[PDB]
Scaffold this active site. Structure first.
Site, PDB file in Angstrom:
ATOM      1  N   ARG A  32       0.840  -1.183   0.000  1.00 36.05           N
ATOM      2  CA  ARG A  32       0.000   0.000   0.000  1.00 36.05           C
ATOM      3  C   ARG A  32       0.885   1.245   0.000  1.00 36.05           C
ATOM      4  NH1 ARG A  32      -4.783  -1.891   4.331  1.00 36.05           N
ATOM      5  NH2 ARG A  32      -5.544  -3.594   3.004  1.00 36.05           N
ATOM      6  N   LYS A  58       0.028   0.201   8.982  1.00 29.80           N
ATOM      7  CA  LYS A  58       1.264   0.687   9.592  1.00 29.80           C
ATOM      8  C   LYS A  58       2.109  -0.451  10.157  1.00 29.80           C
ATOM      9  CE  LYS A  58      -0.684   3.687  12.306  1.00 29.80           C
ATOM     10  NZ  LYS A  58      -2.016   3.871  11.666  1.00 29.80           N
TER      11      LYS A  58
HETATM   12  N1  LIG Z   1       0.254  -4.128   1.751  1.00 33.75           N
HETATM   13  C1  LIG Z   1      -0.891  -4.650   2.256  1.00 33.75           C
HETATM   14  N2  LIG Z   1      -1.726  -5.383   1.484  1.00 33.75           N
HETATM   15  C2  LIG Z   1      -2.868  -5.910   1.963  1.00 33.75           C
HETATM   16  N3  LIG Z   1      -3.273  -5.760   3.236  1.00 33.75           N
HETATM   17  C3  LIG Z   1      -2.534  -5.048   4.120  1.00 33.75           C
HETATM   18  C4  LIG Z   1      -1.271  -4.440   3.673  1.00 33.75           C
HETATM   19  N4  LIG Z   1      -0.751  -3.803   4.741  1.00 33.75           N
HETATM   20  C5  LIG Z   1      -1.605  -3.990   5.782  1.00 33.75           C
HETATM   21  N5  LIG Z   1      -2.663  -4.737   5.410  1.00 33.75           N
HETATM   22  C6  LIG Z   1      -3.806  -5.143   6.263  1.00 33.75           C
HETATM   23  O1  LIG Z   1      -4.436  -3.997   6.839  1.00 33.75           O
HETATM   24  C7  LIG Z   1      -5.018  -4.372   8.089  1.00 33.75           C
HETATM   25  C8  LIG Z   1      -4.825  -3.276   9.125  1.00 33.75           C
HETATM   26  O2  LIG Z   1      -3.439  -2.969   9.222  1.00 33.75           O
HETATM   27  P1  LIG Z   1      -2.833  -2.395  10.597  1.00 33.75           P
HETATM   28  O3  LIG Z   1      -1.435  -2.934  10.760  1.00 33.75           O
HETATM   29  O4  LIG Z   1      -3.864  -2.569  11.688  1.00 33.75           O
HETATM   30  O5  LIG Z   1      -2.732  -0.829  10.245  1.00 33.75           O
HETATM   31  P2  LIG Z   1      -2.819   0.311  11.376  1.00 33.75           P
HETATM   32  O6  LIG Z   1      -1.753  -0.081  12.373  1.00 33.75           O
HETATM   33  O7  LIG Z   1      -2.532   1.578  10.602  1.00 33.75           O
HETATM   34  O8  LIG Z   1      -4.227   0.205  11.913  1.00 33.75           O
HETATM   35  C9  LIG Z   1      -4.346  -5.661   8.533  1.00 33.75           C
HETATM   36  O9  LIG Z   1      -5.341  -6.683   8.625  1.00 33.75           O
HETATM   37  C10 LIG Z   1      -3.359  -6.003   7.435  1.00 33.75           C
HETATM   38  O10 LIG Z   1      -3.425  -7.395   7.111  1.00 33.75           O
HETATM   39 MG   LIG Z   2      -1.257   0.280  14.680  1.00 32.64          MG
END
Ligand SMILES: Nc1ncnc2c1ncn2[C@@H]1O[C@H](COP(=O)(O)OP(=O)(O)O)[C@@H](O)[C@H]1O
Ligand SMILES: [Mg+2]
Ligand SMILES: Nc1ncnc2c1ncn2[C@@H]1O[C@H](COP(=O)(O)OP(=O)(O)O)[C@@H](O)[C@H]1O
Ligand SMILES: [Mg+2]
Ligand SMILES: [Zn+2]
Ligand SMILES: [Zn+2]
Lengths: 531, 530
Positions: A32, A58
């Site tokens: 992403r 993140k």
């Molecule tokens: N490059 C990616 N492609 C597909 N899904 C992703 C990618 N990066 C993160 N995710 C998904 O996004 C969801 C939320 O991510 P998260 O680490 O909770 O982000 P944040 O910490 O910003 O809330 C997770 O279930 C993860 O599997």
């Molecule tokens: Mg987080």
């Protein structure tokens, strides 16, 4: 903020291992936005701050580099529930990770303490609360030996905004986290947060002794999200019936989220949805990890279509194909509403964000945020957003994300942009002078009027002691009188008065500070209405 | 905010105020700014009083409570601090109480009824900020009490905790703005020892006080004689020098000894008692019945010296404290001022002797590793101990950004009274030399404690460096200690902390300012004794 463009390449020495790890460990196909750039900065051993909306991805930005490096990455997390969310995912992928907190049993601490210096440890990520840094002499000594032994190589501070004193959810122990860079300078540090609050950020890098580091921010605008505000029916069963009608009409068989104000609301909506033919499941931040798995798996398997969540710190529900997010009640703030509604359409395809606006919800939420110094102002901004009919909803939201929001055009992706309606200004001055008469008579009587009592007296109902003799009722539906009072509250012709009762905070209405303007007969109060 | 206009006794309550002052609290006169602050609260206006610890801030809200209807709500951050006040008020026959997290249900019910009891004798109710933010029931009773005109005044002790621009920000102090919002006819008074105008203006917003008077006390304690002495290497010889000093100068007089650590205070106490000095240890966490015992024995001179440990929450307040001896230096100039400021509260001459020990620099530096500015705050204290050519009040005033002069001290500190002759010495060659040992320690991959690298400087310690003619400079150890400490303050050298299983340990390394020694014209000077 720094420009990431130069880092959006896969021609680094580690780039091959990174793409390997991304696809064959995390089982993801592509990065992403800002994921590759942030990873490349960390992988090059440099300090980086990442500003990305909740649900943006993140965690990957520090979890993936840990798996491509030797030794382990220390992750600073503010909540044990947040660590369990991360350990649940890492455990499912077969990645060795663990956590330490104050309540950790002694046999587990002894294990982690030994694994940190064990050159043949499988541990790649170690999640600790900031108390383990500030209030644990033993852990620091192991970190020093792990660091000397080339096994402690990276530092990740999740929710890095807790460091600064001007941001959400300040933790005292985050102030001491500056020791990490001072004592472990060869360890790279990454800061993750969803706020932008540039003072908070520039301050956090000073508290962390990581001043100026690369700072990357994602574009917070989600062009695939359709923003909508709906009237919330006064009748609770008519509301749940309209929700089920909306889900089957527009989102037949598609996954979605419903945000509720309270813990009771979230549970009662779920059983109501289940009876009305919608498979639903509640999700909460305080849940056990095995309860969270129960919801996450049924949601992925389409056993439950809607996940009814309650707004709290610790929401670990993330699905890429969330087609709709319904707000059962409005958020506490515009910033909260963006993050909560922003969980829709993470697959970059169109998704709807439906907000149900209710007059009664103004006072229910206002009473709950009475202790937050700016809770009322932040809620009235949300109410003002619900009241707006003549501005693009994306413009209104972007007002709160000034430094991280692209001016990019809405392209009819919100109701106000789509509806070809004309508007008209109506004079409501005489209605205000009526409400002030009712409220002044209640003051002479030492009676506190709720909105319920105030509207009732306006209509010629309720206690006849609270009615005014010559005040003819307005011959308007109760919800037009609600709209009028809501307008007088935002414009501060009326104001809220809170009363602390044994078991709850209660809102009363009172003559607002702008009511004196009605002493000058030339002052005219108007209202924009739909025509 | 001019206090002169308030420094008068022609108010309707002025007779009642003096009545209460002399017949309940049993004081004869007001200290500076007390009457003015009391008059501002009594006339129903908001007031912030900035006054050093021990200055008498508590009276400025306790006395008005006794002259007003109903009770005064006191916001206090620590349970030990409210117990310190509740002990005094009980002694004086004033009805006061407290509510905390551990409060028993029957005591909460009692307090809750007294707040709405129109004939209640409760004049002061001490609560923690969580009782305001996280207690529906208490706010509910506060509202009833306020409507019944029984809740009339609010006192916010340590009001600096409101603002996050300051380091003592207590999160629950953020919600304390609800008080003025919900209870506007109740006047609010803010008490603090921290002067900074920056934090105080923000606290006035957080508390939603529009028209706020601010009175500030001066730092200067003209009767206090400030002195710095060498700390002897032997613990037993030090305690003997202390007993000699008490029996020599302060025969039979009350005093305080401030210790760095918990066992220092206990070890000093028993050594004093055996050596013929009746002494007692004091801690901030102590039981209110133990604190009562200490104060009572102190007043009756059953115990002469109170051995305290530097901490937040010390309620040792005796008006006739003739000497304050710092067994180890304070962690900061702010702490040293307040700790030494407990002497001579009777306006008579009192002595403040600080014992400066080279090893104490690192004992404190390692203990303050977690404070973001712990090291900088300590080096200011070490700089004060090192100074020989400036008036102590100039150094203290420098801490508050005040300027000062020896004429204003008027022979009331050691540097003003004992005039010693001095000279600027060129110690650059000593610095380049000290860096050589540290560079060689890098080559052998082990680093040095403070004890090491005097030893190499003198030709000791397992033959660490013996090249390029590093004979000892023909200067005593205490002089070599001062030289390194000067090089630590001026960052040609710097500290390195190591976290071991049970404690933090300090090492030395080449500081960041060593680059200037590439310019041979750069001269590092230091004043030493003749
Ligand atoms: N490059 C990616 N492609 C597909 N899904 C992703 C990618 N990066 C993160 N995710 C998904 O996004 C969801 C939320 O991510 P998260 O680490 O909770 O982000 P944040 O910490 O910003 O809330 C997770 O279930 C993860 O599997
Ligand atoms: Mg987080
Ligand atoms: N006007 C006064 N005259 C004599 N003693 C006083 C006076 N005001 C206060 N004190 C004494 O000073 C001591 C410390 O006062 P305190 O209320 O602790 O001040 P602070 O809150 O600023 O530390 C108390 O024991 C009190 O009896
Ligand atoms: Mg006090
Ligand atoms: Zn739009
Ligand atoms: Zn002097």
């Amino acid at each position: 903020m720094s420009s990431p463009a130069s880092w959006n390449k896969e021609d680094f020495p580690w780039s091959g291992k990174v793409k390997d790890v991304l696809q064959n460990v995390f089982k993801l196909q592509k990065f992403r936005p800002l994921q590759l750039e942030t990873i490349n900065v960390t992988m090059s051993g440099k300090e980086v701050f990442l500003v990305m909306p909740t649900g943006g991805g993140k965690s990957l930005c520090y979890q993936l580099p840990a798996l491509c490096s030797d030794g382990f990455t220390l992750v600073i997390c503010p909540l044990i529930s947040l660590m369990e969310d991360q350990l649940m995912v890492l455990k499912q992928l077969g990645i060795s990770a663990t956590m330490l907190n104050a309540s950790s049993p002694k046999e587990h601490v002894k294990w982690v303490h030994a694994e940190m210096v064990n050159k043949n440890s499988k541990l790649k990520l170690i999640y600790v609360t900031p108390e383990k840094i500030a209030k644990s002499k033993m852990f620091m000594s192991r970190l020093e030996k792990a660091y000397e032994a080339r096994r402690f190589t990276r530092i990740a501070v999740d929710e890095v905004h807790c460091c600064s004193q001007w941001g959400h959810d300040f933790r005292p122990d985050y102030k001491a986290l500056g020791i990490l860079k001072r004592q472990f300078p060869n360890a790279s540090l990454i800061g993750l947060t969803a706020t932008a609050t540039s003072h908070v950020l520039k301050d956090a890098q000073k508290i962390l002794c990581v001043e100026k580091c690369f700072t990357f921010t994602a574009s917070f605008n989600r062009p695939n999200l359709y923003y909508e505000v709906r009237q919330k029916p006064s009748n609770t069963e008519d509301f749940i019936e309209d929700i089920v009608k909306l889900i089957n009409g527009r989102y037949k068989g598609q996954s979605g989220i419903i945000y509720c104000f309270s813990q009771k609301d979230s549970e009662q909506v779920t059983i109501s949805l289940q009876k009305l033919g919608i498979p639903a499941g509640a999700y909460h931040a305080n849940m056990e990890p095995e309860d969270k798995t129960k919801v996450h798996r049924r949601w992925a398997a389409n056993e439950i279509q809607v996940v009814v969540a309650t707004v709290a710190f610790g929401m670990g529900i993330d699905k890429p194909d969330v087609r709709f997010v319904i707000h059962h009640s409005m958020s506490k703030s515009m910033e909260n509403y963006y993050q909560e509604s922003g969980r829709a359409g993470r697959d970059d395809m169109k998704a709807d964000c439906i907000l149900y606006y209710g007059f009664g919800d103004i006072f229910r939420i206002s009473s709950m945020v009475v202790m937050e110094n700016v809770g009322q102002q932040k809620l009235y901004e949300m109410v003002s957003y619900c009241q707006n009919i003549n501005k693009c909803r994306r413009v209104l939201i972007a007002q709160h994300f000034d430094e991280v929001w692209s001016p990019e055009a809405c392209n009819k992706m919100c109701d106000n942009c789509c509806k070809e309606i004309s508007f008209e200004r109506k004079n409501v001055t005489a209605y205000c002078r009526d409400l002030i008469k009712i409220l002044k008579q209640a003051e002479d009587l030492n009676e506190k009027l709720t909105p319920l009592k105030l509207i009732d007296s306006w209509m010629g109902k309720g206690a006849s002691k609270l009615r005014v003799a010559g005040l003819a009722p307005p011959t308007l539906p109760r919800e037009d009188l609600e709209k009028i009072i809501a307008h007088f509250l935002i414009q501060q012709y009326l104001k809220e008065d809170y009363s602390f009762t044994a078991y709850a905070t209660i809102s009363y209405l009172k003559v607002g500070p702008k009511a004196n303007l009605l002493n000058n007969e030339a002052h005219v109060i108007t209202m924009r209405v739909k025509k």
